[PDB]
Design a protein around this ligand. Structure first.
Ligand SMILES: [Cl-]
Ligand SMILES: [Cl-]
Ligand SMILES: [Cl-]
Ligand SMILES: [Cl-]
Ligand SMILES: [Cl-]
Ligand SMILES: [Cl-]
Ligand SMILES: [Cl-]
Ligand SMILES: [Cl-]
Ligand SMILES: [Cl-]
Ligand SMILES: [K+]
Ligand SMILES: [K+]
Ligand SMILES: [K+]
Ligand SMILES: [K+]
Ligand SMILES: [K+]
Ligand SMILES: [K+]
Ligand SMILES: [K+]
Ligand SMILES: [K+]
Ligand SMILES: [Zn+2]
Ligand SMILES: [Zn+2]
Ligand SMILES: [Zn+2]
Ligand SMILES: [Zn+2]
Ligand SMILES: [Zn+2]
Lengths: 361, 353, 356, 359, 374
């Protein structure tokens, strides 16, 4: 099988469990931000995903309505949603808004919430209403409806709360962290836009049209290593719908309409194998042709080696701890190179030369 | 060459209301009827809140849709029984405690958006693929909380307590102060697909509570209308009004086939079988609720019932219609009257003590 | 290490039948029940025609769908009350006068094609755009003739007269000869969304006739089961059987992931539910699909746990030849309604319900 | 008793064009605007090919629909930014090199059949069940070739080279010869759901490129219109025209029943106008009353006989109308119904330029 | 206990081809048949381009869909007559001039994306709301140009001229050089909803050209198969293969379930409960159900015999018990037990055949005369 040795790892908080909701964008964002707070000497935090999921879905519903249904309304999101969110809505501690509380559970199950809110948003955004109703202050009634339903399933966001003896609002709690959205950059590597420029990734969950800086593939990978080696972690958005991404905690990239199938019915991923190291063009083809699509968010926090000396990034996942390495995955460098869609890191995690090529002061 | 009407007899009614852009005529007509009853019973003039009863009725209708996995349709209509069940179960509140339009800066109902949202929500539960609906620690259902909250956003918050003419009430104690009783009222109809002098629930979408009606032969059925008006009672009248004979100019006629609907004409007087065919074949379907409160004659001596409608007062007779007896005989689906409005012999045949 | 059952008491039943490929258990179980009643009442052994009653019930169901413009769903199921209403309204006929499968060269039902046609026909009237349905000179509706004629092609022609054991009957006079009366039977349930000791119609799709059930608290409800069996009666038993605890091996016992998206027999102690737990399952869709069977006895396993003995209508190719054992705990949690003869009720419960 | 208009000031425009049966007003208006810019800049009179730019824009729009699995809608509309992005990316060609209607023996556009085919194709890729789209040996996508080929069949073959007034050009070199620059132009709007004096992308279906607009308070926004016209500039004007006040007779002025189920001279002469607040304008955008962004060119200011003020509007519906394809829009209408405008940076008043940080 | 086959007689065939991910068996089997005909006629070995004919046929099928406002379904299938009509109307080209997969960097067909696009396009014209389709100045229809262009993008550009073995041809002149004639070939079937010895068009979706078949009583129909093989001809064979008897392991059998039980050790109860793997219905020689004309008719009327897959019968074989089978060249490549060849029992062929095409001279003289074929 695989035997892994840590080469370097940076501090992370405990492994969380998103359970039955597509909220990995927020869990991974918060694993990342909690590592940042540890790195910045602020200590250990447990931030409320539900608070930010709640506020983000209200904005996503608004985007769906303003675009008459073009912006899809669904459970996913982006790292930028979390960075925009902290600056706009604030932050609250986990205990002020926990998953599952409204329906007598301790973990999320958002299937019913989505059934209701998807139908409501569609009825406004894609229906035949010619003039939406508003109150005497021009506040929209449909927005009040969608907010009220989200509160019934997710909880009431607090206006004030007490944390470790001090009273905060979500805004003042955020301010106390010292985090700034402007400290963080999103990076990607594709050829349908020029290198060293910014563009918004064309994926459904980037409905805020947040920008990413575009780097050639080798410089892109240089950022991963520099980040980990200088003490930073990485918010990692990747496609994980590959036979190489397994339930047994490893993600590898090994080098390997039928008429007939209609009328009738190797050890590739289980031990170290030589990896396919993709070119920029191969990586591009997979993004263009739908092979690399479904952006699942995780945190890379370290580098490890297998017994044959192959290199892997160490990944904190948000599926709880019931797995081979207690909620941790190992992703080969070859996998990460081919299947990564975007990353977010602190600006100071970037090598000086790359920073200069991107024009980041 | 038009209609000239002379009142033969009419009983007291309250002011003409306007349901505007909602299918809530079942509640407006029920309350016109109950307000006439209160006047008749010496309790004075009331203006009851339709919105309070519409709100509570819709929450029960949604529950019925969900329990039947979508068989019970979820829509804006309802029945006289919804109002009678409602007053006994939820109570009553004065108009001013829950007015139409308030939530969206109007004074009249427009429920198109509320229906767009609540129809979609109810369908997502009742007709979707959810295998286990979510509940809180007290086994209260989350979807019900959602549907209630959305109805409150568009219709208003129903009051738990309020003050009316110097006294504090709950909706229950306000209802109790009126002296109204559901058991005083009977629903009557006339069809041949069930035996006469028995009770059955009319097979129409808005009777999802499966309320019962007593079945009478057509001539005895019409005898009840006249006896009611002539002895001082009014009638909650449920009728099909989708006929060329029912007009915007305030008359509902049943002429024998131009000037068919614009002056007095000889009327087609239907048989029981003709009335039945129209119910069986979809020609008599869409039960709109109104109040009959009097009898009138045209200049040729043809007889009409005087009808209080709920479309406001911007019409030829200020919100009042005249429906010919022939029309009423053919197109009525059901009526509600106080038990004492029934002639003694008919009461006895129905077994109503 | 399996189950070994010992009969404590059982009452007489007729042979196990097979509904095969149709959702007609409501009628098979009703008739297993009524045939047990006839044995109990000294009338001897009958084999009544399910198909005759299924035929007539579907024509009424279509009418209900059309009158309500599609609110009443049109499908294969039904209720105990459909059978009891049926016998009084349409009559009864012996099995041999209208057998399953005959029209398509089989001996067991397969109603898939019949349903494909009749569902489509009923929907075209009930949910379509026709503004005036057609009728003949006697005001008889043409669409009803069409739906009747199609049902006859697949189910058979109901007899107007027939001979049985040397005498001529109509379906009505055959029913009259049985001595059965619908008024002898009561439907019972146990739920808290209506008051106890009152009647209401269970809010399920197959109760489109809106037949009433008397509502009892859960413990009194279970008292009725035992009293019935112990005094010689059987029970028409409507239950949810879509549970991991209900098995193909003849025993019924008490039992949107991001991660799941990306990847892929002996006596046990029973959970004894409360009224509130039972209610939650009915309210939340966990207890929904009312399948009809007949409880005719009480049995024990080797550890002394108690079970009701159940006659099913899936034929005899199963571990106990078409018989099931349902634990008392299962029955308590998953029962939707039962029908028993009034005299099967304990006297005190009869009085609380106002049943003379 | 009707309207009589007197021009106060108007700036040079080219002839009135006719988009006919296609939702391509975004391109016709952009080009009316750019042709006025060329006149203003001393480059003379041009007639630029809308079809060339419509063609290239639709291929990019199909790509956006496919990359977003159908979120970006695929339809005939677009934005001013589509034209500005387009000239810099694809180039420009003269009208005669790609005319409307030519492929189907007409001289005006009718794109109903083209849209029927291409909408169906794009949806089969973007919203279907294909798990892996096909590509050739150079990683070029087959579906893109298909959509390009079908657009050529209906719109024409875009030229690689052509001759215009004695000189050979490519679309890129023709664009370069005009001296136009996308960076000379800014998009402006006025809404309160984002802060004033910042940039954001208007949340409308035809802004699928997510082009940015600078946000101004309503009074400063209107100041820009007047300053532009009065200093010799024209305006690319994006507005909702689905109002009883917008008429077929060339003037734009400020304007579930149970019962309906069973059963004034407002726009024809000068009237007092409702002058909207920022909040009223916002409500209409939020509530769907102001939605369908149609593109036109404002090129002047006029007065009616009572002294009320109007902007003069070059439309793209041909010349068979009261004022030969020109409309008059009251200042009150423009204030309430405008969604966005594009002007040259030098059309902006100095103080507004400074507040926006535009050097 | 499996099958062991001995060839009794087989006629020359070309190599086994692979249609891969497209429903183009009608063309592959037609061309296996026509290539056998060319060998029989002394013209040597050819490898004809299926893709050329698939391309042209689909353009005609789209036209038929549009003219009938969607009644003619637009899909990947077709008929033997499509190939015979095609060679006379469009011509023929060698494989190398238009190969499967080339446009998308493969060597085998995958037409899923092509169909997803072209189905949607044809439906937008045939079943949409367009009241007047657009045309150019020569009255050529724009939608046809669109569908042709898209098919070329996925299938390739059909050649106007090409060189083959030192000579220049057009598709027409290449067809002429083969000596093949559509009029040499007849389609035969056996059904009772039309009179015997008459012609009618089989009522199936892929016969949208309404090509005719001659109708024979079942026993005379089967006589044709044997006479064809025994006198040196092969057969284009259209059959239903959606049966438990048609297997991935290269046999198509029609076992009598009732008889197989009574020969086993199991009683009727002990059997029905046994696992399919131990019944042995399709894995060794078993007594066959031999259908009557009426049973064969019922299966066509009731949807049990419906989906025409096309293959080539080129020989007759026996199993170790002396039961008879037709030898079948399939178009699913060579990765199978008998390298792409199937053995179909005579009982299977009798019950499940929908139609065949053979050269007229393959028909026994007396049958030829009863059909009026000079
Ligand atoms: Cl994901
Ligand atoms: Cl509840
Ligand atoms: Cl109505
Ligand atoms: Cl049976
Ligand atoms: Cl069952
Ligand atoms: Cl033009
Ligand atoms: Cl490409
Ligand atoms: Cl326009
Ligand atoms: Cl033979
Ligand atoms: K947390
Ligand atoms: K993938
Ligand atoms: K009122
Ligand atoms: K009517
Ligand atoms: K029976
Ligand atoms: K032009
Ligand atoms: K070939
Ligand atoms: K078959
Ligand atoms: Zn995820
Ligand atoms: Zn009404
Ligand atoms: Zn069942
Ligand atoms: Zn326009
Ligand atoms: Zn095939």
């Amino acid at each position: 099988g695989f035997v892994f040795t840590t080469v370097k790892e940076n501090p992370i908080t405990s492994v969380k469990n998103q359970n039955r909701a597509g909220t990995c964008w927020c869990y991974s964002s918060y694993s990342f931000l909690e590592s940042e707070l540890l790195r910045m000497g602020k200590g250990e935090y447990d931030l409320s995903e539900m608070f930010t999921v709640y506020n983000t879905y209200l904005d996503r519903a608004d985007a769906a309505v303003r675009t008459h249904g073009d912006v899809s309304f669904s459970q996913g999101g982006s790292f930028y949603d979390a960075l925009y969110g902290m600056e706009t809505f604030g932050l609250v501690p986990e205990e002020e808004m926990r998953p599952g509380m409204m329906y007598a559970d301790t973990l999320s199950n958002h299937t019913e919430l989505s059934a209701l809110t998807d139908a409501m948003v569609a009825a406004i955004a894609k229906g035949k209403l010619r003039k939406l109703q508003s109150d005497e202050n021009n506040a929209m009634l449909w927005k009040k409806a969608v907010a009220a339903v989200h509160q019934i399933y997710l909880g009431v966001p607090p206006e004030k709360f007490t944390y470790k003896g001090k009273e905060y609002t979500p805004k003042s709690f955020f301010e106390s962290t010292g985090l700034k959205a402007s400290d963080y950059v999103s990076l990607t590597s594709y050829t349908h836009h020029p290198f060293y420029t910014q563009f918004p990734l064309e994926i459904q969950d980037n409905w805020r049209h947040g920008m990413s800086y575009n780097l050639p593939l080798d410089e892109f990978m240089e950022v991963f290593d520099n980040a980990i080696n200088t003490g930073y972690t990485i918010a990692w958005g990747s496609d994980v719908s590959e036979s190489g991404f397994t339930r047994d905690g490893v993600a590898v990239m090994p080098d390997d309409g039928s008429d007939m199938a209609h009328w009738l019915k190797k050890k590739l991923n289980t031990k170290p194998q030589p990896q396919k190291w993709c070119t920029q063009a191969e990586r591009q083809l997979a993004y263009d042709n739908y092979e690399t699509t479904d952006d699942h968010g995780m945190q890379i926090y370290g580098i490890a080696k297998d017994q044959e000396g192959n290199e892997y990034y160490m990944v904190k996942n948000s599926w709880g701890t019931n797995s081979k390495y207690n909620g941790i995955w190992y992703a080969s460098k070859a996998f990460v190179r081919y299947k990564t869609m975007n990353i977010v890191v602190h600006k100071d995690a970037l090598p000086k030369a790359i920073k200069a090529k991107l024009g980041i002061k």
